PDB file of C-alpha atoms and ligand atoms in Angstrom:
ATOM      1  CA  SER Y   1       2.741  19.341  -0.024  1.00 42.21           C
ATOM      2  CA  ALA Y   2      -0.249  17.356  -1.769  1.00 41.44           C
ATOM      3  CA  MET Y   3       2.051  14.365  -1.793  1.00 41.13           C
ATOM      4  CA  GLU Y   4       1.784  14.332   2.232  1.00 40.42           C
ATOM      5  CA  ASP Y   5      -1.968  14.752   2.236  1.00 40.29           C
ATOM      6  CA  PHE Y   6      -2.295  12.038   0.099  1.00 42.38           C
ATOM      7  CA  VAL Y   7       0.540   9.959   1.818  1.00 38.66           C
ATOM      8  CA  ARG Y   8      -1.686  10.415   5.285  1.00 37.82           C
ATOM      9  CA  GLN Y   9      -5.157   9.825   3.403  1.00 37.46           C
ATOM     10  CA  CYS Y  10      -3.949   6.727   1.669  1.00 35.05           C
ATOM     11  CA  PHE Y  11      -1.675   4.676   4.228  1.00 31.10           C
ATOM     12  CA  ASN Y  12      -2.454   3.738   7.496  1.00 27.87           C
ATOM     13  CA  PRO Y  13      -1.245   6.096  10.379  1.00 27.68           C
ATOM     14  CA  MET Y  14       1.342   2.727  11.481  1.00 28.61           C
ATOM     15  CA  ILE Y  15       2.907   2.455   7.963  1.00 26.22           C
ATOM     16  CA  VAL Y  16       3.169   6.393   8.152  1.00 25.81           C
ATOM     17  CA  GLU Y  17       4.805   6.459  11.600  1.00 30.01           C
ATOM     18  CA  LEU Y  18       7.491   3.881  10.575  1.00 29.32           C
ATOM     19  CA  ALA Y  19       8.013   5.605   7.293  1.00 31.34           C
ATOM     20  CA  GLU Y  20       8.925   9.187   8.934  1.00 30.78           C
ATOM     21  CA  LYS Y  21      10.967   7.065  11.626  1.00 30.84           C
ATOM     22  CA  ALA Y  22      12.891   5.452   8.600  1.00 33.09           C
ATOM     23  CA  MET Y  23      13.460   8.884   7.294  1.00 33.00           C
ATOM     24  CA  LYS Y  24      14.931  10.222  10.606  1.00 31.14           C
ATOM     25  CA  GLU Y  25      17.212   8.021  10.152  1.00 28.22           C
ATOM     26  CA  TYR Y  26      18.021   9.061   6.503  1.00 26.84           C
ATOM     27  CA  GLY Y  27      18.134  12.645   8.496  1.00 25.62           C
ATOM     28  CA  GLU Y  28      15.618  13.705   5.957  1.00 24.02           C
ATOM     29  CA  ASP Y  29      12.584  15.441   5.866  1.00 23.98           C
ATOM     30  CA  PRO Y  30       8.934  13.841   4.790  1.00 26.88           C
ATOM     31  CA  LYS Y  31       7.649  17.370   3.762  1.00 26.16           C
ATOM     32  CA  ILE Y  32      10.758  18.020   1.507  1.00 27.67           C
ATOM     33  CA  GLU Y  33      11.297  14.497   0.141  1.00 26.75           C
ATOM     34  CA  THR Y  34       7.698  13.727  -0.248  1.00 25.15           C
ATOM     35  CA  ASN Y  35       8.421  10.784  -3.186  1.00 26.63           C
ATOM     36  CA  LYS Y  36      10.553   9.216  -1.371  1.00 25.33           C
ATOM     37  CA  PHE Y  37       7.639   9.272   1.644  1.00 28.17           C
ATOM     38  CA  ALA Y  38       5.523   7.792  -0.760  1.00 28.96           C
ATOM     39  CA  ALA Y  39       8.139   5.299  -1.782  1.00 29.26           C
ATOM     40  CA  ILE Y  40       8.744   3.829   1.569  1.00 29.92           C
ATOM     41  CA  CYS Y  41       5.008   3.963   2.631  1.00 29.54           C
ATOM     42  CA  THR Y  42       4.559   1.725  -0.361  1.00 28.97           C
ATOM     43  CA  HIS Y  43       7.099  -0.563   0.274  1.00 27.92           C
ATOM     44  CA  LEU Y  44       6.294  -0.829   3.690  1.00 27.68           C
ATOM     45  CA  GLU Y  45       2.777  -1.957   2.585  1.00 30.22           C
ATOM     46  CA  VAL Y  46       3.939  -4.216   0.276  1.00 33.28           C
ATOM     47  CA  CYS Y  47       6.151  -5.966   2.707  1.00 29.31           C
ATOM     48  CA  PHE Y  48       3.242  -6.258   5.412  1.00 28.58           C
ATOM     49  CA  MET Y  49       0.439  -7.411   2.543  1.00 30.41           C
ATOM     50  CA  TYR Y  50       3.415 -10.147   1.315  1.00 26.30           C
ATOM     51  CA  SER Y  51       4.133 -11.011   5.531  1.00 25.27           C
ATOM     52  CA  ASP Y  52       0.236 -11.222   6.076  1.00 25.90           C
ATOM     53  CA  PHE Y  53      -0.556 -13.443   2.897  1.00 26.35           C
ATOM     54  CA  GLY Y  54       1.085 -16.609   5.018  1.00 26.55           C
ATOM     55  CA  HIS Y  55       3.188 -18.046   9.899  1.00 24.67           C
ATOM     56  CA  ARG Y  56       4.637 -18.606   7.127  1.00 24.83           C
ATOM     57  CA  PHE Y  57       6.843 -15.275   6.586  1.00 24.48           C
ATOM     58  CA  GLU Y  58       9.108 -13.082   9.312  1.00 26.89           C
ATOM     59  CA  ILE Y  59       8.702  -9.792   8.888  1.00 27.96           C
ATOM     60  CA  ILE Y  60      12.034  -7.670   9.196  1.00 26.13           C
ATOM     61  CA  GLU Y  61      11.158  -4.697   7.420  1.00 27.81           C
ATOM     62  CA  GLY Y  62       9.714  -2.131   9.456  1.00 27.62           C
ATOM     63  CA  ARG Y  63      12.043  -2.918  12.691  1.00 27.72           C
ATOM     64  CA  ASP Y  64      14.842  -0.903  14.040  1.00 27.13           C
ATOM     65  CA  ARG Y  65      17.923  -1.802  12.922  1.00 28.42           C
ATOM     66  CA  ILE Y  66      18.903  -3.591  16.544  1.00 24.22           C
ATOM     67  CA  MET Y  67      15.759  -6.244  15.996  1.00 26.19           C
ATOM     68  CA  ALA Y  68      16.073  -6.508  12.213  1.00 27.32           C
ATOM     69  CA  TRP Y  69      19.373  -7.793  12.825  1.00 26.21           C
ATOM     70  CA  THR Y  70      18.290 -10.022  16.314  1.00 27.54           C
ATOM     71  CA  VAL Y  71      15.814 -11.301  14.302  1.00 25.50           C
ATOM     72  CA  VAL Y  72      18.033 -12.089  11.321  1.00 23.68           C
ATOM     73  CA  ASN Y  73      20.733 -13.609  13.975  1.00 25.63           C
ATOM     74  CA  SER Y  74      18.040 -15.997  15.928  1.00 25.76           C
ATOM     75  CA  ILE Y  75      17.095 -17.127  12.005  1.00 25.78           C
ATOM     76  CA  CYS Y  76      20.242 -17.925  11.499  1.00 23.93           C
ATOM     77  CA  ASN Y  77      21.090 -19.416  14.269  1.00 19.17           C
ATOM     78  CA  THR Y  78      18.186 -22.005  14.151  1.00 18.55           C
ATOM     79  CA  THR Y  79      18.223 -22.924  10.823  1.00 15.16           C
ATOM     80  CA  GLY Y  80      21.857 -22.431  10.005  1.00 17.64           C
ATOM     81  CA  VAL Y  81      20.849 -20.268   6.737  1.00 14.78           C
ATOM     82  CA  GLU Y  82      23.441 -17.951   5.800  1.00 17.34           C
ATOM     83  CA  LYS Y  83      23.509 -14.299   7.257  1.00 16.56           C
ATOM     84  CA  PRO Y  84      23.070 -11.903   4.631  1.00  9.90           C
ATOM     85  CA  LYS Y  85      24.835  -8.578   3.990  1.00 10.36           C
ATOM     86  CA  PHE Y  86      22.415  -6.439   4.020  1.00 10.00           C
ATOM     87  CA  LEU Y  87      19.208  -6.358   5.715  1.00  8.11           C
ATOM     88  CA  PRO Y  88      16.692  -8.450   4.089  1.00  8.06           C
ATOM     89  CA  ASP Y  89      12.667  -7.757   4.041  1.00  9.23           C
ATOM     90  CA  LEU Y  90      11.000 -11.105   5.014  1.00 10.94           C
ATOM     91  CA  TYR Y  91      12.093 -14.615   5.475  1.00  9.23           C
ATOM     92  CA  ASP Y  92      10.374 -17.634   4.025  1.00  7.68           C
ATOM     93  CA  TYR Y  93       9.700 -20.963   6.726  1.00  7.31           C
ATOM     94  CA  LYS Y  94       8.670 -22.454   4.137  1.00  6.23           C
ATOM     95  CA  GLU Y  95      11.236 -22.426   1.443  1.00  2.01           C
ATOM     96  CA  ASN Y  96      13.488 -21.753   4.554  1.00  2.00           C
ATOM     97  CA  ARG Y  97      15.216 -18.606   2.647  1.00  2.00           C
ATOM     98  CA  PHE Y  98      15.581 -14.693   2.802  1.00  2.00           C
ATOM     99  CA  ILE Y  99      13.012 -12.341   0.601  1.00  2.00           C
ATOM    100  CA  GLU Y 100      14.235  -8.667  -0.367  1.00  2.00           C
ATOM    101  CA  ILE Y 101      10.960  -7.200  -2.041  1.00  2.00           C
ATOM    102  CA  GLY Y 102      11.074  -4.641  -4.681  1.00  2.00           C
ATOM    103  CA  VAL Y 103       8.668  -1.835  -5.791  1.00  2.00           C
ATOM    104  CA  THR Y 104       9.392  -0.094  -8.716  1.00  2.00           C
ATOM    105  CA  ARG Y 105       8.528   2.758 -10.868  1.00  2.48           C
ATOM    106  CA  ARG Y 106      10.331   1.369 -13.984  1.00  2.00           C
ATOM    107  CA  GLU Y 107      10.659  -1.846 -15.852  1.00  2.00           C
ATOM    108  CA  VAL Y 108      10.968  -4.813 -13.317  1.00  4.68           C
ATOM    109  CA  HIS Y 109      13.648  -5.936 -15.153  1.00  5.32           C
ATOM    110  CA  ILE Y 110      15.979  -2.902 -14.954  1.00  5.15           C
ATOM    111  CA  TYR Y 111      14.980  -2.549 -10.921  1.00  6.12           C
ATOM    112  CA  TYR Y 112      15.786  -6.266 -10.810  1.00  9.10           C
ATOM    113  CA  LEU Y 113      18.782  -6.418 -11.925  1.00  9.92           C
ATOM    114  CA  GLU Y 114      19.702  -3.507  -9.856  1.00  6.85           C
ATOM    115  CA  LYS Y 115      18.713  -5.362  -6.859  1.00 11.15           C
ATOM    116  CA  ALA Y 116      20.469  -8.363  -7.842  1.00 13.72           C
ATOM    117  CA  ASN Y 117      23.795  -6.929  -8.541  1.00 15.66           C
ATOM    118  CA  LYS Y 118      23.592  -5.110  -5.184  1.00 16.37           C
ATOM    119  CA  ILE Y 119      22.433  -8.190  -3.065  1.00 18.35           C
ATOM    120  CA  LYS Y 120      25.341 -10.425  -4.292  1.00 16.05           C
ATOM    121  CA  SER Y 121      23.632 -13.261  -2.782  1.00 18.27           C
ATOM    122  CA  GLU Y 122      21.969 -16.025  -4.589  1.00 18.52           C
ATOM    123  CA  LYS Y 123      20.550 -17.348  -1.399  1.00 18.24           C
ATOM    124  CA  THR Y 124      18.457 -14.440  -1.047  1.00 16.97           C
ATOM    125  CA  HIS Y 125      15.117 -14.638  -2.776  1.00 20.69           C
ATOM    126  CA  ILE Y 126      14.561 -11.594  -5.086  1.00 21.66           C
ATOM    127  CA  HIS Y 127      10.661 -10.495  -5.632  1.00 20.20           C
ATOM    128  CA  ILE Y 128      10.136  -7.019  -7.421  1.00 19.43           C
ATOM    129  CA  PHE Y 129       6.628  -5.784  -8.316  1.00 19.64           C
ATOM    130  CA  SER Y 130       5.606  -2.783 -10.377  1.00 19.97           C
ATOM    131  CA  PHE Y 131       2.673  -0.115 -10.257  1.00 20.27           C
ATOM    132  CA  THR Y 132       1.407  -1.782 -13.582  1.00 21.58           C
ATOM    133  CA  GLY Y 133       0.785  -4.991 -12.501  1.00 17.73           C
ATOM    134  CA  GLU Y 134       4.392  -6.879 -13.450  1.00 19.14           C
ATOM    135  CA  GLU Y 135       6.459  -8.892 -11.173  1.00 19.80           C
ATOM    136  CA  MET Y 136       9.600 -10.719 -11.374  1.00 18.30           C
ATOM    137  CA  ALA Y 137      11.390 -13.036  -9.222  1.00 17.26           C
ATOM    138  CA  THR Y 138      14.697 -15.094  -8.599  1.00 18.26           C
ATOM    139  CA  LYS Y 139      13.603 -18.321 -10.426  1.00 17.24           C
ATOM    140  CA  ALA Y 140      10.645 -17.139 -11.618  1.00 16.92           C
ATOM    141  CA  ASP Y 141       9.351 -18.547  -8.248  1.00 15.02           C
ATOM    142  CA  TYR Y 142       7.095 -15.728  -6.970  1.00 17.89           C
ATOM    143  CA  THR Y 143       6.689 -17.485  -3.460  1.00 16.81           C
ATOM    144  CA  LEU Y 144       3.072 -16.385  -2.942  1.00 19.69           C
ATOM    145  CA  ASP Y 145      -0.369 -17.907  -4.799  1.00 19.87           C
ATOM    146  CA  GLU Y 146      -1.532 -15.868  -7.514  1.00 21.47           C
ATOM    147  CA  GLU Y 147      -4.477 -14.350  -5.598  1.00 24.31           C
ATOM    148  CA  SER Y 148      -2.104 -12.558  -2.812  1.00 23.84           C
ATOM    149  CA  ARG Y 149       0.009 -11.489  -5.818  1.00 24.37           C
ATOM    150  CA  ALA Y 150      -3.164  -9.828  -7.113  1.00 22.72           C
ATOM    151  CA  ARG Y 151      -4.133  -8.309  -3.926  1.00 23.12           C
ATOM    152  CA  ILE Y 152      -0.365  -6.275  -4.015  1.00 20.81           C
ATOM    153  CA  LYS Y 153      -0.777  -6.097  -7.633  1.00 21.64           C
ATOM    154  CA  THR Y 154      -3.974  -3.938  -7.591  1.00 22.61           C
ATOM    155  CA  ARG Y 155      -3.178  -2.311  -4.451  1.00 22.20           C
ATOM    156  CA  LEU Y 156      -0.156  -0.910  -6.119  1.00 23.34           C
ATOM    157  CA  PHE Y 157      -2.014   0.280  -9.324  1.00 25.29           C
ATOM    158  CA  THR Y 158      -4.479   1.663  -6.872  1.00 29.42           C
ATOM    159  CA  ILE Y 159      -1.820   4.185  -5.709  1.00 29.46           C
ATOM    160  CA  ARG Y 160      -0.419   4.971  -8.777  1.00 34.03           C
ATOM    161  CA  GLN Y 161      -4.084   6.020 -10.250  1.00 32.00           C
ATOM    162  CA  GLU Y 162      -4.558   7.958  -6.677  1.00 31.16           C
ATOM    163  CA  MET Y 163      -1.550   9.667  -7.287  1.00 27.55           C
ATOM    164  CA  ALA Y 164      -2.407  10.247 -10.971  1.00 27.73           C
ATOM    165  CA  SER Y 165      -5.947  11.407 -10.344  1.00 27.65           C
ATOM    166  CA  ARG Y 166      -3.553  14.071  -7.735  1.00 24.01           C
ATOM    167  CA  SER Y 167      -1.528  15.002 -10.369  1.00 24.79           C
ATOM    168  CA  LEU Y 168       1.317  13.284  -8.345  1.00 24.82           C
ATOM    169  CA  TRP Y 169       2.113  10.227 -10.312  1.00 25.25           C
ATOM    170  CA  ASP Y 170       4.520  12.186 -12.993  1.00 27.97           C
ATOM    171  CA  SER Y 171       6.939  13.761 -10.417  1.00 28.32           C
ATOM    172  CA  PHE Y 172       6.763  10.391  -8.445  1.00 25.08           C
ATOM    173  CA  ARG Y 173       7.613   7.991 -11.486  1.00 23.71           C
ATOM    174  CA  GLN Y 174      10.221  10.448 -12.727  1.00 24.85           C
ATOM    175  CA  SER Y 175      12.189  10.155  -9.156  1.00 26.90           C
ATOM    176  CA  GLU Y 176      13.789   7.127  -8.278  1.00 26.15           C
ATOM    177  CA  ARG Y 177      14.018   7.854  -4.565  1.00 27.07           C
TER     178      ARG Y 177
HETATM  179 MN1   MN K   1      14.176  -3.761   3.475  1.00 28.05          MN
HETATM  180 MN1   MN K   2      12.595  -4.008  -0.117  1.00 28.41          MN
END
């Protein structure tokens, strides 16, 4: 598929490898679930950019479940912050709170409501990004400075435009995988 080629050309090999590992966890094949492949790569890249724009942030996404829960447990033991139900994406040492990052091809408020209804934890901060430069965060607290968020928005829009140039955007956005 052209989607796999695009993924291997636009994403660095480490992100592609982690995404393939996550698909093995899912028991899914990157050559069949190509849109899920692109979405997982995009979410990983956004989480890594978010963490690098700070060390203010502890990365939880991208680790295997053992190490992710080990990191979450150590953070909870040191800070006393409540342990989340689901594995979040980041921990913010400055605000002392876990962060769930969302990347959606739909409207940001719809996805925000979906994520907030899932996580059921007022403590965990939510930050949603779209491929159109829109964002939505808990209490309108965007955590990052405007420059870092602009970098993330530019990266997402560029991914959307590369997909559209390769005639892949319609399939990707119409899919919720
Ligand atoms: Mn995650
Ligand atoms: Mn996430």
